[PDB]
């Protein structure tokens, strides 16, 4: 928990205040552009269900992955920035992203 982006944002967003979460992905796009993926390419989710959608374009994403030396309370993350297609599972009305399935 020492000032790279992942350590800072995992703490701020309440993911690592009470545990170290092994992996998390942050999407640097507007909320409505990420919500727009729920009407883009329909694909199967990893679990087999079919309410997943893949973005037509790549999006700016930061992957945060715990190091092999990370132990609560001192969570530590390797930060990887990339531009990738995101795959989200969608539910509700309005039909909105509720789970991040993958980036490709």
């Amino acid at each position: 928990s020492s000032s790279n982006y992942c350590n800072q944002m995992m703490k701020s967003r309440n993911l690592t205040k009470d545990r170290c979460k092994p992996v998390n992905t942050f999407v640097h796009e507007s909320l409505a552009d990420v919500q727009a993926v729920c009407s883009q390419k329909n694909v199967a989710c990893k679990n087999g269900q079919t309410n997943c959608y893949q973005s037509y374009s790549t999006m700016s994403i930061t992957d945060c992955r715990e190091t092999g030396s990370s132990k609560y309370p001192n969570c530590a993350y390797k930060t990887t920035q990339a531009n990738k297609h995101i795959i989200v599972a969608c539910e509700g009305n309005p039909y909105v992203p509720v789970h991040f399935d993958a980036s490709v």
Partner: peptide
């Protein structure tokens, strides 16, 4: 409390 859609935004969006 927090809906599933709200949790997705808190955990994964950084606009």
């Amino acid at each position: 409390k927090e809906t599933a859609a709200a949790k997705f935004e808190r955990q994964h969006l950084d606009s």
